Design a protein around this motif. Structure first.
Motif, PDB file in Angstrom:
ATOM      1  N   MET A 104       0.792  -1.273   0.000  1.00 32.42           N
ATOM      2  CA  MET A 104       0.000   0.000   0.000  1.00 32.42           C
ATOM      3  C   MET A 104       0.822   1.322   0.000  1.00 32.42           C
ATOM      4  SD  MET A 104      -3.493   0.978   0.947  1.00 32.42           S
ATOM      5  CE  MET A 104      -4.022   2.379  -0.047  1.00 32.42           C
ATOM      6  N   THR A 135      -0.515  -1.183   9.557  1.00 29.00           N
ATOM      7  CA  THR A 135      -1.192  -0.401   8.515  1.00 29.00           C
ATOM      8  C   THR A 135      -0.984  -0.986   7.163  1.00 29.00           C
ATOM      9  OG1 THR A 135       0.682   1.100   8.208  1.00 29.00           O
ATOM     10  CG2 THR A 135      -1.010   1.744   9.835  1.00 29.00           C
ATOM     11  N   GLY A 136      -0.026  -1.881   7.060  1.00 27.90           N
ATOM     12  CA  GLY A 136       0.272  -2.554   5.786  1.00 27.90           C
ATOM     13  C   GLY A 136       1.348  -1.925   4.942  1.00 27.90           C
ATOM     14  N   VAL A 188       1.927   9.707  11.523  1.00 28.97           N
ATOM     15  CA  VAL A 188       0.960  10.728  11.100  1.00 28.97           C
ATOM     16  C   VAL A 188       0.821  10.716   9.571  1.00 28.97           C
ATOM     17  CG1 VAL A 188       0.601  13.184  10.825  1.00 28.97           C
ATOM     18  CG2 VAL A 188       1.370  12.306  13.106  1.00 28.97           C
ATOM     19  N   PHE A 203      -0.874   7.354   8.204  1.00 28.94           N
ATOM     20  CA  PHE A 203      -2.321   7.388   8.511  1.00 28.94           C
ATOM     21  C   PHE A 203      -3.108   8.395   7.674  1.00 28.94           C
ATOM     22  CE2 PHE A 203      -1.777   4.522  12.009  1.00 28.94           C
ATOM     23  CZ  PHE A 203      -3.052   3.986  12.219  1.00 28.94           C
ATOM     24  N   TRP A 232      -3.233   6.988   4.259  1.00 31.28           N
ATOM     25  CA  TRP A 232      -4.189   5.861   4.342  1.00 31.28           C
ATOM     26  C   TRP A 232      -5.619   6.376   4.447  1.00 31.28           C
ATOM     27  CZ3 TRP A 232      -4.708   1.583   8.662  1.00 31.28           C
ATOM     28  CH2 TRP A 232      -5.245   0.430   8.076  1.00 31.28           C
ATOM     29  N   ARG A 233      -5.765   7.478   5.166  1.00 28.71           N
ATOM     30  CA  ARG A 233      -7.074   8.136   5.278  1.00 28.71           C
ATOM     31  C   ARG A 233      -7.565   8.554   3.884  1.00 28.71           C
ATOM     32  NH1 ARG A 233      -9.450  12.874   4.839  1.00 28.71           N
ATOM     33  NH2 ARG A 233      -7.428  13.785   4.381  1.00 28.71           N
ATOM     34  N   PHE A 289      -8.828   4.138   4.192  1.00 24.63           N
ATOM     35  CA  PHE A 289      -8.455   3.119   5.122  1.00 24.63           C
ATOM     36  C   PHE A 289      -8.804   1.784   4.597  1.00 24.63           C
ATOM     37  CE2 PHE A 289      -9.351   6.579   7.845  1.00 24.63           C
ATOM     38  CZ  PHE A 289      -8.091   6.775   8.264  1.00 24.63           C
ATOM     39  N   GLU A 290      -8.564   1.636   3.313  1.00 24.25           N
ATOM     40  CA  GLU A 290      -8.548   0.422   2.562  1.00 24.25           C
ATOM     41  C   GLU A 290      -7.876  -0.727   3.259  1.00 24.25           C
ATOM     42  OE1 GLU A 290      -9.656  -0.580  -0.013  1.00 24.25           O
ATOM     43  OE2 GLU A 290      -8.408  -2.335  -0.256  1.00 24.25           O
ATOM     44  N   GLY A 291      -8.671  -1.726   3.585  1.00 24.96           N
ATOM     45  CA  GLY A 291      -8.209  -2.918   4.250  1.00 24.96           C
ATOM     46  C   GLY A 291      -8.140  -2.836   5.746  1.00 24.96           C
ATOM     47  N   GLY A 292      -8.777  -1.845   6.315  1.00 23.41           N
ATOM     48  CA  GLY A 292      -8.684  -1.640   7.726  1.00 23.41           C
ATOM     49  C   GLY A 292      -9.933  -1.681   8.546  1.00 23.41           C
TER      50      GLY A 292
END
Lengths: 141, 156
Positions: B1, B25-26, B141, B144, B147-148, B152-155
């Protein structure tokens, strides 16, 4: 701007890191005793009722970080002077304390399901920064 | 990711934190020698790291070796610096992006920052002063936020 509250923290380095993160971001730090270590804008409280007594936070604006009965932290709107309540890196928040929090005031960070706890300092940094983002990074730059 | 790159990390704990942040988080972790500390399966395990967490990280010999082995897309490789940089949150991030951080003490060597286009330079918002945000906090930070932006794919 934001209030970070650590409930009975265990690892000295985490608080150290948190202390510094507050300076860098303008956030206030609250500690709820007992602490796992000696400690020589910040305030230590004796226990939770004392903290509740002295700070009288707005219950609608005080958020607890728990994996039970919670939503996604990022799905909520935050405001300056919100309270963000974190438990010890190992236990997390005592259930009894969590029981004092309404569902809507229960939050968690997205994570791969699994998995060990994020270091506490990291957890706090992500939380403060996301709220700060919503608040337009006022005073920062 | 996402890809985190720590260039000559100095303080062990920070890297242990990032190893955990990555697991959680991957994100894929890249380290650039020389490091400040030995890296070791046992050491990492006594520091409380599992073997899924640190197994699939990559250590490179220097920046050239890394550029060689990974061939990152330059337009999607972002350096954290305070000189010639935009604000991090003012950009859009895509899966596969590279985030490049310097040692806690000095940050990215000037020479390295020199290989970065301005639009590939970024900083975290911060009260002017000051001191550095801790390394691992900085990394968490950033991941995230990216990822936000990614849902948040996969979370959860």
């Amino acid at each position: 701007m934001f209030n970070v509250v650590l409930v009975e923290p265990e690892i000295p380095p985490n608080t150290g890191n948190v202390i510094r993160l507050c300076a860098n971001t303008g956030a206030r730090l609250h500690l709820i005793e007992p602490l796992g270590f000696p400690l020589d804008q910040m305030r230590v409280h004796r226990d939770w009722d004392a903290f509740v007594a002295a700070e009288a936070p707005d219950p609608a604006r005080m958020f607890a970080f728990t994996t039970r009965g919670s939503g996604r932290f990022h799905d909520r709107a935050f405001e300056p002077g919100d309270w963000f309540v974190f438990g010890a890196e190992t236990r997390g928040l005592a259930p009894a304390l969590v029981d004092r929090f309404a569902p809507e005031q229960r939050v968690r960070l997205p994570m791969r399901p699994g998995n060990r706890s994020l270091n506490l300092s990291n957890t706090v940094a992500v939380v403060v920064f996301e709220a700060w983002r919503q608040a337009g990074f006022e005073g920062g730059a």
